[PDB]
Design a binder for this molecule. Structure first.
Ligand SMILES: C=C(/N=C/c1c(COP(=O)(O)O)cnc(C)c1O)C(=O)O
Ligand SMILES: C=C(/N=C/c1c(COP(=O)(O)O)cnc(C)c1O)C(=O)O
Ligand code: NA
Ligand code: NA
Lengths: 387, 387
């Protein structure tokens, strides 16, 4: 209808990560990194034009209007109320994760993640010389679940100081229930663990699934937990480089901001600020339209794979626009899977093994593209699977 | 038919640092932070419109065209030849300084600066729990000069591991001679010091003074020295957030890039990349024209202050568009000077004391604005100085 979800803008010649390989091999169709193929909402494009027409591109600060936009988005969309002083802007969520690790732990101390998970989680812990504790998620009835007995064991046995939670969880697209988050929080309270809730996918919950922001679970959770999010995944504006932490606890907030300044990682670009404010101000109708398209694409993929590759195990996302595929029933190695998809099927999917050992013989599929493209990508995925 | 240096775009609705106080108090005229009031070169404005017209604002990386533009600028403007692989982009120079401190020293080790100097120098050392060694610049015949005897004493007595050099030096605008840089480099070789040369103002040398980029002084200097620079100060694009380190030594380069990744400080915004490439590709004629305006503004200020405030000691910049003013002959304290300028004169100048103890009773004046505004600011500065 009014917004364009039919035709993908041509990204070749714009130095995108997503289309980089395709620029050398034109047959390759990318469906990996979490950028969407869709045109961004028109108000953001207009805001970039308006930025140009400032004529001067000097140092700018985070305005009260931007702060209010974040406050209003969190309250309106996620029922999460806090003060403007609790917002800390950071040029990205992955930046924020390293700052959090450096601020809240010392070298050698243990940081826990639920594996398999977005690879910068494990990387950021290891490169910072913290001890990584991978709490392996169970898979039951096609969904990831937390083994709470082993999670406590992992916390206690390793003296875990910090828990990097992914909510919604990437990969898999798991939209944790309030009851799950409450159990996590109680464990953090018991064992004196600080929790960082990476909620970057929070606006992308689907099929009736509702995001529960971590500190909305219990009024005391802010004593040990902070929330990271952004407009970038929601609105396909990852190249504008802005995001935020909500840190209501004064001590945690000071410690984060201090580390951020120690790292000189405290400034954001002018368009970073503009694009986030604009997206939150005008983006809701576009987001509604987006989510309908994503649901149709996911449903199509699940049904198509059921019909054309019944042996392929498909985890239906509860949120995110990313589908976790399990090729374990096929007579392939992890490396042979990669070369089959990339070289024979000519489709670029994230290698599941990037996400941890649980990702062996998996791949991750990005369906945030026009339906015609999603149909082509799914056709390629089933085309060359071995008997 | 000509570049505009006659009128300044209105900044008041655009959340600039420079005009922030004036938004609340319309009587105040800013001349502090190093943003220019001048319109940016027209090709950058067009590049921002062109970015808007990509329609999708996803993750991008530094292109070969951008890398070549930096290489070409460094060779043509500064006679500094190196390879594309030696370039490391960082969202800002101040970011790069923290990364360098973290990468090249251990907690508790000594880092040297020449004081007084841009305040993030001292701050980045101190906040990083390194020992700060301030090598105090002499002032002789209106110019800063290094005391090489004391500099060596400072290096040896404190076991200095890292030297943060400012060239051109801010404040004061001192354009160090080749022979001065030679002697600095030789001390670093003798005492096994790593040197970071902050050359962000390298394109703004004036009155026939020529920038000498540090690693051009001797082919050996790359073994211990790296250069930081940017398009942002040269072209008035600080809000676009991109800059680079040139690190020809493989070990130093790996060290820096490693720490940058540990800190998740490795990515830059898409417009950051675009604005730098464009500025370097098209900016030379604009820069030529700017320099003539800056020299005129500086000459006006010196002459005006000479007549209207002969007791005011004015350090004439050899480069940068910033003038270091010394009010120490007046019966004022540092705090009374600030109050006088800000509350009585209604002008916002950087407090000299921000830059170190040598800046007591000083202020710094930004003349990168139309001559009419410079004239007004200078008139205000001399209106209310005490007998
Ligand atoms: C783009 C992807 N993920 C984005 C992501 C990010 C990206 O953050 P920044 O772009 O803001 O650094 C952060 N946290 C989580 C849990 C994420 O899934 C991807 O998996 O391709
Ligand atoms: C804007 C100012 N100085 C800029 C500056 C900067 C600014 O760097 P980034 O904006 O790239 O972080 C870095 N290094 C030196 C020696 C500088 O003088 C000022 O003094 O107001
Ligand atoms: Na594992
Ligand atoms: Na001092």
């Amino acid at each position: 209808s009014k917004y364009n979800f039919q035709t993908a803008p041509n990204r070749l010649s714009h130095h995108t990560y997503k289309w980089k390989e395709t620029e050398t091999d034109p047959q390759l169709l990318p469906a990996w990194i979490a950028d969407m193929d869709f045109e961004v909402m028109p108000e953001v494009k207009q805001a970039i034009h308006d930025y140009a027409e400032q004529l001067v591109y000097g140092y700018t600060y985070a305005s009260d209007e931007l702060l209010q936009a974040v406050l209003d988005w969190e309250k309106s969309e996620h029922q999460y109320s806090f003060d403007k002083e609790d917002i800390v802007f950071v040029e990205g969520v992955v930046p924020a994760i390293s700052i959090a690790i450096q601020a809240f732990t010392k070298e050698g101390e243990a940081v826990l993640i639920n594996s398999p998970v977005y690879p910068p989680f494990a990387r950021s812990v290891r490169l910072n010389n913290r001890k990584l504790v991978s709490n392996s998620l169970k898979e039951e009835n096609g969904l990831f679940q937390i083994d709470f007995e082993q999670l406590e064991n992992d916390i206690v046995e390793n003296d875990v100081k910090l828990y990097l939670l992914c909510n919604p969880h990437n990969p898999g697209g798991r939209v944790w229930e309030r009851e799950v988050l409450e159990q996590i929080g109680h464990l953090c309270q018991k064992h004196h663990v600080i929790l960082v809730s990476d909620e970057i996918h929070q606006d992308l919950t689907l099929f009736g699934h509702e995001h529960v922001s971590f500190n909305t679970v219990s009024p005391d959770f802010k004593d040990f937990a902070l929330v990271l999010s952004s407009a970038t995944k929601t609105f396909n504006i990852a190249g504008t480089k802005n995001s935020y932490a909500i840190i209501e606890n004064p001590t945690l907030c000071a410690q984060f901001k201090h580390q951020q300044l120690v790292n000189n990682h405290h400034e954001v670009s002018s368009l970073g600020y503009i694009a986030t404010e604009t997206a939150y101000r005008y983006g809701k109708p576009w987001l509604v339209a987006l989510k309908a398209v994503l649901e149709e694409n996911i449903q199509f993929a699940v049904e198509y794979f059921a019909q054309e590759a019944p042996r392929l195990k498909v985890m239906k996302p509860q949120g995110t626009y990313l589908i976790w595929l399990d090729f374990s029933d096929y007579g392939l190695t992890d490396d042979a899977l990669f070369t089959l998809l990339h070289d024979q099927a000519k489709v670029i999917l994230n290698r599941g093994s990037d996400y941890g050992s649980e990702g062996e013989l998996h791949a991750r599929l990005n369906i945030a593209a026009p339906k015609s493209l999603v149909e082509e990508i799914c056709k390629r995925i089933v085309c060359c699977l071995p008997k």
